[PDB]
Amino acid sequence: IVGGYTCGANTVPYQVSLNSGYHFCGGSLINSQWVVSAAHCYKSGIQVRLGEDNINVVEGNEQFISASKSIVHPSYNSNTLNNDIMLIKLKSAASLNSRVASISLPTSCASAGTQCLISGWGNTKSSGTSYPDVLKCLKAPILSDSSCKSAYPGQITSNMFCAGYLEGGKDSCQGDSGGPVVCSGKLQGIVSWGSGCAQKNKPGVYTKVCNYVSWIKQTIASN
Ligand SMILES: [Ca+2]
Numbered sequence: 033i034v035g036g037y038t039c040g041a042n043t044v045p046y047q048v049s050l051n052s053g054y055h056f057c058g059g060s061l062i063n064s065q066w067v068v069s070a071a072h073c074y075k076s077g078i079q080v081r082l083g084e085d086n087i088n089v090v091e092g093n094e095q096f097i098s099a100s101k102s103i104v105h106p107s108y109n110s111n112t113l114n115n116d117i118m119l120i121k122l123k124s125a126a127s128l129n130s131r132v133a134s135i136s137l138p139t140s141c142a143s144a145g146t147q148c149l150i151s152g153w154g155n156t157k158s159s160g161t162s163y164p165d166v167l168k169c170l171k172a173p174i175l176s177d178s179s180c181k182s183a184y185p186g187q188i189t190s191n192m193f194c195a196g197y198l199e200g201g202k203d204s205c206q207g208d209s210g211g212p213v214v215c216s217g218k219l220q221g222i223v224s225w226g227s228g229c230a231q232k233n234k235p236g237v238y239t240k241v242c243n244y245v246s247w248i249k250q251t252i253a254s255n
Contacts, residue, residue: 033150033151033152033154033156033168033169033170033203033204033205033208034155034156034157034158034170034201034202034203034204034205034229034230035170035201035202035203035230036150036156036168036169036170036202037168037169037170038166038167038168038169039085039151039166039167039168039169041085041086041091041093041166041167042083042085042093042130042131042132043169044149044151044167044169044212045083045130045131045132045133046060046061046062046133046134046135046212046214046219047059047060047084047151047152047167047211047212048060048061048067048069048080048081048082048084049080049081049084049087049153050067050069050073050078050079050080050081050120050210051078051079051080051081051096052075052077052078052079055081055087055153055207056073056075056207057069057070057073057207057209057210057211058151058152058153058154058207058208058209058210058211058212058223059073059080059120059210059211059212060135060211060212060219060222061082061126061132061133061134061135062134062135062137062219062248062252063134063252064122064125064126064127064128064134065121065122065125065126065252066119066120066121066122066252067080067099067119067120067121067122068117068118068119068120068219068222068241068248069117069118069120069210069211069222070116070117070118070209070210070222070223070224070239071104071105071108071110071115071116071117071118072110072113072116072209072210072224072225073118073209073210074102074104074118076102078098078099078102078120079096079097079098079099080096080097080098080099080120080122081094081095081096081097082094082095082096082097082126082132083095083129083131083132084167085166085167086165086166087153087165087166088165089165093129093131093132095126095127095132097122097123097124097126098122098123099120099121099122099123100121100122100123101120101121101255102118102119102120102121103118103119103120103121103251103255104118105117105118105244105247112187112189113192113224113225113237114189114191114192115191115239116222116224116225116239117222117239117241117244119248119251119252119255121252121255135212135214135217135218135219136217136218136219137218137219137241137245137248137249138218138219138220138241138242138245139218140242141220141240141242141243142174142215142216142218142220142242143174144173144174144175144176144177145173145174145176146173146174146215146216146220147171147172147173147215148171148172148173148174148195148213148214148215148220148221149169149170149171149212149213149214149215150169150170150171150172150195150204150208150211150212150213150214150221150223150236151167151168151169151170151208151211151212152167152168152204152207152208152209152211152223153165153166153167153168153207153208154168154204154205154206154207154208154209154211155205155206155207155229156168156205157229158200158201158203158205158228158229158230158231163207170202170203170204172195172196172197172202172203172236173195173196174193174194174195174215174220175193175194175195175196175198175235177193177194179194179198179235180192180193180194180235180237183198183233183234183235184227184237188237190240190243191239191240191243191244192224192237192238192239192240193220193221193237193238193240194235194236194237194238195213195221195235195236195238196235196236197235198232198233198235199232200230200231200232200233200234201230202230203226203229203230203231203235203236204223204226204229204236205226205229205230206229208223209223209224210222210223211223213238213241219241220238220240220241220242221238221239221240221241222238222239222241223236223238224236224237224238224239225237
């Protein structure tokens with residue numbers, strides 16, 4: 033996250049880190065047994081790490097749980113990043129507590145101008161490389177679909193939305209992929225792609241979760 037702030041430990045309790053020997057993607061806990069992330073985060077041998085703040089220090093509220101099953105969206109297209117969403121099932125149920133909490137699926141889509149919370153452990157500089165070890169947070173609004181389509185002609189689908197600031201300076205970035213975008217207490221977005229980070233007239237692009245709730249609910253009940 034570029035231009036954000038330190039969230040505070042476990043102030044974002046649905047936040048997970050996907051770990052394959054190292055942190056490589058964010059994710060969101062949606063119930064005690066299931067995590068949602070980005071399809072581009074797909075890999076084998078994933079361990080899900082819950083209750084994290086500093087991802088390099090064991091602080092006492094962590095739960096480390098291997099994934100039993102991963103399900104990439106059936107229509108995920110790696111070239112265009114359409115349908116950039118995946119479900120991960122935990123080998124054993126997480127223990128929910130103040131520090132580890134699930135986030136609610138939306139009942140409707142969010143409107144442009146709605147304020148959202150984006151979080152993650154990704155790079156914090158737009159120019160350089162600097163990875164934080166504590167969770168960073170950014171408040172950002174959903175942009176109008178026409179600002180979004182203007183920035184990225186021919187690349188935005190109905191399953192994507194843009195959020196951030198056209199002036200640049202504040203954005204998600206490398207290492208934040210798969211993480212949550214929470215607006216009005218509901219998961220509305222997944223960190224998906226962008227061009228650079230925090231560059232002018234290049235806002236972040238997010239998977240539009242409100243389009244997938246039926247698929248999510250049907251898939252978790254069948255697996
Ligand atoms: Ca830790």
